[PDB]
Amino acid sequence: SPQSPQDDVTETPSNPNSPSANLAKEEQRQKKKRLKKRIFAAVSEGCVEELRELLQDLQDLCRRRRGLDVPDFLMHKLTASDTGKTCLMKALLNINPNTKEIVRILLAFAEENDILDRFINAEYTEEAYEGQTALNIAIERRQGDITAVLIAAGADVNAHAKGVFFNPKYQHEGFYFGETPLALAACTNQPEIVQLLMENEQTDITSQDSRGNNILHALVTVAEDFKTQNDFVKRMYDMILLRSGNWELETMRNNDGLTPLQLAAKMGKAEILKYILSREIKEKPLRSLSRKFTDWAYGPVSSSLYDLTNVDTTTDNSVLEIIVYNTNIDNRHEMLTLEPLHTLLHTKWKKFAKYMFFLSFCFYFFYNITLTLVSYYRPREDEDLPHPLALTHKMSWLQLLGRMFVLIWATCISVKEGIAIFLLRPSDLQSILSDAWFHFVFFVQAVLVILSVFLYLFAYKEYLACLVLAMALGWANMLAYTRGFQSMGMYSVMIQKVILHDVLKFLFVYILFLLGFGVALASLIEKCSKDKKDCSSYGSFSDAVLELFKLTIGLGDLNIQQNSTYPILFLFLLITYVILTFVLLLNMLIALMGETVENVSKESERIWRLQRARTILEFEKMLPEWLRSRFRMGELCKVADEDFRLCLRINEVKWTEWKTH
Amino acid sequence: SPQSPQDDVTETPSNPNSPSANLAKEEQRQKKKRLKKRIFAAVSEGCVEELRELLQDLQDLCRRRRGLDVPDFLMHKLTASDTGKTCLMKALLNINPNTKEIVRILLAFAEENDILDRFINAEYTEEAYEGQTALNIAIERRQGDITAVLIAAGADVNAHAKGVFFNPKYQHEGFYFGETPLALAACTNQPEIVQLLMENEQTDITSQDSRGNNILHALVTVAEDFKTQNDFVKRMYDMILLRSGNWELETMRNNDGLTPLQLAAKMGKAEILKYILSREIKEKPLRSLSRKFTDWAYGPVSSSLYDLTNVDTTTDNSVLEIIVYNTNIDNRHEMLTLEPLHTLLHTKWKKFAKYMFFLSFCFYFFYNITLTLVSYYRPREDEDLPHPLALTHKMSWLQLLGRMFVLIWATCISVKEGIAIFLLRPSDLQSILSDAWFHFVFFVQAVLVILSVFLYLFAYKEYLACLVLAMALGWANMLAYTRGFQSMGMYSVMIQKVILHDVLKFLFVYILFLLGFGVALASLIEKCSKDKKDCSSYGSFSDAVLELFKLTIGLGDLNIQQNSTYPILFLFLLITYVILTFVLLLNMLIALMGETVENVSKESERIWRLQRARTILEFEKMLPEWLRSRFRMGELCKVADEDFRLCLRINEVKWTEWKTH
């Protein structure tokens, strides 16, 4: 939210006398700052004939010069003031109708010397914009005609302006076009400059950022979450790719090891990825970049073959891997209903996950029941404080059928949920607590069990209490297998979301009343009996809390004024309390409840698909070495070589309906 | 809501015979009212040749005249009837296609005499429209061609029509264009007349209203809260300022001492102030009026310097001062997200108020806790009625650590909240009770404390009861520091707003039932036992109230009919009561509750920023003499003189996205 340019912003009208104080060299009232600054303003205005004479004395001052120091001196004369900026910078920061005319005069000046190629390729010694040259500024101010002269000048079109200006944050303090002169035109919608630059033979394309980024990674960090009114970002994108002609250009990773597809999922520019994945451009020496092999399309049916390169979980960092396990995406449901991403998901549950979810459900269902009968019919209240495993096969066989099953599946889930403590969970009180909250409550469940068995060997009079809280928490985790059905998968989010949303807010307020009114209630008893008459009354501070909270829920009684010492202010405080909490605040929280619920009841399918998509990779994570049948359509060529890329299969869409007569 | 023109509205067709009865001077059946009224209708219709002969006899009647009384007589003949209106008024109140032709004839008439300059600059002796002349009426009826003749006539274009017609109220009984002929054209969208009037050399601009208002203050009282369909109000505004050329013209205050910026915040015309504050018109002899110094703009980044004249709290009546402490503004959140107003706010909390809010929170947090332990563990129930400060350092040291802290911070807040009794609070049951309600409840808190300590020296058997109500009220004010967080700042408004909104309405109704049904309940007992058998029953009127209110909340029992003397009408009244209040009215109030809550839950951020903005100036009010580090970017010049105006710093906006190819 702050900007913080942190220094020397650039091009200020307010100009001190700091650099010219070091170079005195004065002959007439100031020899050089009256020469240097007058160059600037004549550039800054555009007055030509004034500038013609100022360049004449620049030759005249550099006429008197020692051995071969005349080119280097004028650089120290004209540039390297505080930052390294030039007159060509000042020629190109502003704009005026004299600009093209003064530049070609200014171009002809240092052509008389031998440093103009060095002079055109100056860059900032300034730390902030380190590497910024005069080319990009013309590209910034949209002067291809100047740039045509600048291309005719012979300047490096492959510079790297790796200064501070591109940010360590995301979308602030200066943008990330990616330090290259080529991507600047493409990012800023000048396709003619894109063509003309790429037509030049100096033009590398495949060079990389400091981040290791090509030109396409810049295009990832541009577009929106939606269709704008005819953006250029998509039509630039293929326009490079039409000129690219080689499949390798998207095989490039970055410093983070990101395919441009892979980054496009990571940033979440969802609509671009739809255009990325489709690529149905038909041209016989150009199908190598194509990704949509339609052959059998007969009206509303449509045959499909997709590219499927980094999409399945057969490598690290799949595009289905990254879309699910990411935080901070708004429209995460978008990209999911995209056809090869949707179908490969939907087949996989049909082929792999329907069987595994039903199995992992059924074991955990017996697990509470096995916990139940060892907790309700148990004769641990039948005076068996030492050594409960006696002879006669320990009083029954079915005690062993219960006790053995629990001990295995406690540590089975425990090592299973020990894997939840792995590299995940970046944040604390965000979506990871709205997603991995089950893994906390799964894990602490079985730890209570083993501790209770550890308390069964060491009978320490709290063995049974640990079991009880282990058991009711077990049925709470039993609710976590309510994310598959539509009619239940919407349901467990709402107690996960809104209760953490509202009820945490409310009990940072309601306690503050209850801490206040309670001492007010508890002070007005004057101790009066010491529990011989005020037994039907209040008492210590804890004893009124569980009555006011009882009054909060709508329970309790009121005609208890027998020891109050002033039995109206006792009542006036009480009636004010009841009219505060139950009339208003309890009803206040339900009004905030039902509005948030109504938001979630609208967003039903978006959370329902995603939880299915969440667990299916987790089950696919639990699959060693035996995966040949659990694959998808290998070994496919296009026509010519061996198998270029394995694909997937056909689709249908019933919108042959249109109007063309 | 009434209009009330209060007199003599003007230009009626219904005409009595009141002024002509004083001037008889009759020679033929009426000499002059048959002359005077026939002038009017011939003007009122536009018949030319009829009017030509009527002007001829006007010369003929004024032919016979004594010594040099002929010009003054015709004024008393043609004007000064009841109000002072002229024929030129009647020439310009209506309109007809003969109008320009009859006026130039009528202009040529009194040109034969020597009073036509006085005659063109007549004004109303009428008290209502005192000072209204014939120029504005042409400006009203949009006749610049007539006005071109009127400018050629030589009339004062700088008149002051300071009659009743501009109101003592705000937007009623006649408008406030500001009594000047110049502002009338600008307010009524005739820019050609604006140019032509300002082209004239008689034209003052910098003259002031009776209110001390220039032309721009008139423009303040015009526009809307929103973008209309291409209003002229903004494009008139700079059009004066383009012709103005001097910075002084907005330095003018009024009778109230209001800069035109300062008034524009006061009236709340929010969109205008955005245009006021920006002023990015680039022209080299015109940047002196400009306020947006963009120099370093590189795509989606943008360098900014703002004017910052009457904006910070370094003088009286800042524009940030007035936007916060004002009532009666609808879109008060607008103007706040405006960039130099937003940023100077947001930096100031980051620089000054985050530390002060956390400090003022933490002292008040200990204050209730120190109040708590001196209230719960206190042995004032241990029979210490006289002189509770005994020897042995008063029974413990930690009693002195409690008792000293409370006495200081009671009178610390008391003198602090005595400043809340200052010049503020215009109204009683309006937004000031929705804003300064904490200052009431803050202040009465500590007064209860000192009174309780005053009751500790003078043990009057109510010392402890005052402490208790002092304490629970203290935790109620503890809720007032819930305006900083987003998740809590929305929350305390809702109990402040809706409870005063609905529950005050409901208990002007529910008592009326409860006052009714209770006497109905209490009359049917026939006294029956005098508290030996009806102890399990009702009794006096107060004894049934706390049971019906108990039934209102959903508590109590019903099979109590033992002393009723007719135990069905007792029951029929009771069942009718319960089906009235709990089935309906208690549920009625919650339906009104949740709708109002849902309105407020939408408006979350608007109240959240504002309370932060409220207290930060209050903390900035608490800052003497040591403010040099707590400033903002002083001593800035434009280029030429010394420091014209200190500014603020740069911004960013990511909407380089558009379509221009």
Ligand code: NA
């Ligand atoms: Na409702």
